[PDB]
A paper describes a structure:
Artemis is phosphorylated by DNA-PKcs and acts to open DNA hairpin intermediates generated during V(D)J and class-switch recombination. Artemis belongs to a superfamily of nucleases containing metallo-β-lactamase (MBL) and β-CASP (CPSF-Artemis-SNM1-Pso2) domains. The overall fold of the catalytic core of Artemis is similar to that of SNM1A and SNM1B (2 Å backbone RMSD); it has all the key structural characteristics of human MBL fold nucleases, with the di-metal containing active site at the interface between the MBL and β-CASP domains.
We solved structures of three Artemis variants D37A, H33A and an Omenn syndrome patient mutation, H35D. The overall architecture of the three variants is almost identical to WT Artemis. The D37A structure crystallizes with only one nickel ion (M1); Both the H33A and H35D variants exhibited loss of the M1 ion. By contrast, all three variants retained the Zn ion in the zinc finger-like motif of the β-CASP domain. Histidines 33 and 35 are the first two histidine residues in the HxHxDH motif (M1 binding) in the active site. In the absence of active site metal ions, the loop comprising residues 113–119 moves away from the active site and a small rearrangement occurs in α8 (residues 348–358). In both the H33A and H35D variants, α8 moves slightly closer towards β14, compared to the WT and D37A variant. In H33A and H35D variants, both β-strand E and α-helix E shifted upward and away from the zinc finger like motif. Differential scanning fluorimetry (DSF) analyses showed that both H33A and H35D variants are substantially destabilized with ΔTm around -13°C compared to WT Artemis. Our D37A, H33A, and H35D variants lost the ability to digest DNA substrate in vitro, in accord with results with full-length variants.
Residue numbers in the entry: 3 to 361
Write the structure that this text describes.
Amino acid sequence: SFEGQMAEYPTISIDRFDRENLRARAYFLSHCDKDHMKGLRAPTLKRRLECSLKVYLYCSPVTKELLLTSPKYRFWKKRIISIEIETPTQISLVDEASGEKEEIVVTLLPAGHCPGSVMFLFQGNNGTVLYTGDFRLAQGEAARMELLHSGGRVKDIQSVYLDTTFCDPRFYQIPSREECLSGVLELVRSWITRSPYHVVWLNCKAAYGYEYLFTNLSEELGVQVHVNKLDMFRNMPEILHHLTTDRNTQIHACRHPKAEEYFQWSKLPCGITSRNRIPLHIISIKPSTMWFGERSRKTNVIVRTGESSYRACFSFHSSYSEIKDFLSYLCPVNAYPNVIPVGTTMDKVVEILKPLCRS
Ligand SMILES: [Zn+2]
C-alpha cells in the first residue's frame, strides 16, 4: 500500500508516521481520519519531536482546525502549519545532524467533497510528484486545476501516488456525487414529510466525509442531523449549524458504540423510540458503494433491502474509469497504487496502470 515515503523525496512523510517515518524532515496529512493518521500521536513520535525541534506537520486549514480540537493531538499545536489551498508554498527541510538544507514547493489541490482533504503536489530538485490521498474528482476537474499545468499542458509529473481503492475493471463506473446526493435527498424527503414522527437513520461508518451529505440534506429539508459529536466543527459554522447532539430531530446520523455488532441493533443508536408516546416511524439508509461494468447501464442509486431499510450509492473514491481518465490526463512517468483492492495484489494493480504511464 503506501507507507509514508515517496521514492523521489524520502525525507518527507505523508499520511504515515510510524517506523521509517519517525526520521522525517517534514510531515503531511491529507485528511483527518484513523487510516491516514497511523502513528500520529504515538509516544515514539512525541519522543522524536522532543529531540527534533524544526520538524513540522503540514495540512489544509480545515485539517489543522479539526486536529487542534482533539485533546490527544494538542501536543502538535506549535508545530502544525496550514497551507492555503492552491497556493504554492516554499518549505525548507533541514537535516538536524548535518547541514543539508533542502527546499521544496508544495501545492494543495482539492481531492473531493470531504472536509479538509487535499492532494499534495511537490516540486523540488528531484522532479515533480503528486500524492492524491483519498480522492474522487468531478468530471473535467483535474483539467481545470491550473496549478497542475504549465504552458497550457499538464506539468511533467515524474510519479503519482494515488488512491486505487477501486482500481479494477469490475468497478468501471460509479454514479456521480450529484446522482448519489439526489437519490438520498429524495428518499429522505419522501419519508420525513409524511409526519413529524417519520424519521431517518443514516447508517454511516465512523469517518469524516459524510458531512457534505449531512449539510445538503439539512440545507434542502430544514432539519439538523443528529450526530454523536460535533465539537470538531465548533469553528466551522457552515458545517456546525446543520448538525445537532439533541436527538429530537427527524434525521439521525448517530452511531452505536463501535464495539456493537450490526445484528445487535434494534433502533436509533441514541435510543429515541417515540415522541408524545407516538412511535417514531423509522427507515434506515446505509451509504454503500455501488458500481457497474463497462458494458452495463447505471441503475437506481437507492436499493431497498427490507420494508424499512435501504442502501444508497455513495463513494469516497474514484471508479476505475475515473482513475484511468485521471492518470491518462496526468501522463506521469510512474503511477504507484496507495491501496490494493481486496480482490487482488499490489503488483497486479501496478500492471493495470502501466499503459497510462510513460515509463
Ligand atoms: Zn440519534
